[PDB]
Structure formats: structure tokens, C-alpha cells
């Protein structure tokens, strides 16, 4: 079936690599990760957050409305 | 599924409608027999002797 011998036809692509023992496992981990993490967060925040913000607003409103509904209504005891 | 909206498929259906109907009857008779429906088995002349 699908085996490394025959998956696709590729030509004129050169890949240079390094031994794991010749390179650092965490090269520029913070100084490059933090800007990259910020970039990814900026890209994805406008797509992910708004639905959860709406959910939180709905949750707070529903909890407040339920708590108000459980509260006593003075107008029922005017007489 | 407009691929199947053709005259040939209309002819193809008519050729297989009697067969599908026959298999449906087998399923109907099988279900009544297996479950002992007795809503239908009461009508059956000899089977209605049971219950």
C-alpha cells in the first residue's frame, strides 16, 4: 500500500539537515518564541475570542436574570 | 444528485422496482414472523390458531 518507497513524485528538492547532537534543542527559545506566540495570538484572537465573549455575556445575563426571578416581587403584596 | 436524474435511471428503477418490492415483502413477512406481531397474524388463516 502506501509506503515510503512510493508515495509521490518529487524532483529537484534539496533538504539540508543537522544531527541532533550537533544542534541545540532550544535555540533562541524565548527571544523567538515570544514574538512568534504574540504573532499567532494576534492572528487568531479576532477569530476565537468574540464567540466566547458573547457566551460570557449571555452567561452573566442569564445568571442575573435567574437570581432576579428567584427574588421576591413587592407588588404581589400591596394589599 | 442530478447525475441520476436521467431517462436511463428511470428505466433502471422500473427494472428493479418489482425486485425491491419482493424483498420488501420478505422483510415484512420476516418481521411479522420473527416478532409474532399478531396484529397481522390474526388475519392469517392457519397461523391465527396460535394465540
Amino acid at each position: 500500500g502506501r509506503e515510503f518507497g512510493h508515495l509521490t513524485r518529487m524532483r529537484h528538492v534539496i533538504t539540508y539537515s543537522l544531527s541532533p547532537f550537533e544542534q541545540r534543542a532550544f535555540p533562541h527559545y524565548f527571544t523567538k518564541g515570544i514574538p512568534n506566540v504574540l504573532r499567532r495570538t494576534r492572528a487568531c484572537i479576532l477569530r476565537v475570542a468574540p464567540p466566547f465573549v458573547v457566551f460570557y455575556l449571555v452567561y452573566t445575563w442569564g445568571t442575573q436574570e435567574f437570581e432576579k426571578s428567584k427574588r421576591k416581587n413587592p407588588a404581589a403584596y400591596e394589599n | 444528485l442530478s447525475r441520476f436524474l436521467g431517462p436511463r435511471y428511470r428505466e433502471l428503477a422500473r427494472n428493479w422496482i418489482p425486485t425491491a418490492s419482493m424483498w420488501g415483502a420478505v422483510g415484512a413477512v420476516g418481521l411479522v414472523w420473527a416478532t409474532d406481531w399478531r396484529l397481522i397474524l390474526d388475519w392469517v388463516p392457519y397461523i391465527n390458531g396460535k394465540f
Binding site: 518529487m10 528538492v13 | 436511463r8
Partner: protein, 101 residues
Amino acid sequence: SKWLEGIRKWYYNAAGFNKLGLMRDDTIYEDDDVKEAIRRLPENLYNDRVFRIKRALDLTMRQQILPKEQWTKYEEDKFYLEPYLKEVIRERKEREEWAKK
């Protein structure tokens, strides 16, 4: 139409495949028609597509992006696969229409 052109450009920028150096036809889902169209592509176009896809996969592996000036420009994006796919789909439609009769 100018507003349509503007919103199309905005969506092209929003769809971040250009940020990976890819072209529009690289992102197409490889169904049977797309597979046939790829198999009909001339050798140079096929090799360019394969390298672009491999580079995009390498970029996504490291969660990185291509430099700002290397992103595929919307106005210079070439729909290389579109004619071949159109022909393949036309042929499939013809075969299905014949089968309908």
C-alpha cells in the same frame, strides 16, 4: 465592482495561505477531478506546486510564517490549475450526461 474587488482582496489577505507562499490552487482539496488535473499538469508547474506545498508544510510544522515581502501578492496570483480542472470537470460532465441517456 470596485467594492467587490476590495472585499476579494481583503479575504485573500485574511485567508493566510499567501503568508505561506502558497497560491490559491495549492489549497484546493484533492478530489478525483483535482487529482486528474494535477496529473495533467506540465512538469514545471507540477514541480513548482510540489515545492510550494512542501515549503508550506515545513513552515506550518515550525508554526512560522514567510517574510512579509515573500507573501504571494493577490494581483500576481496565477490560477495555473484552473484550466486543467475545468477541462477535467467538463469531461466528467459529458460522461455523466451520456450515462443519463
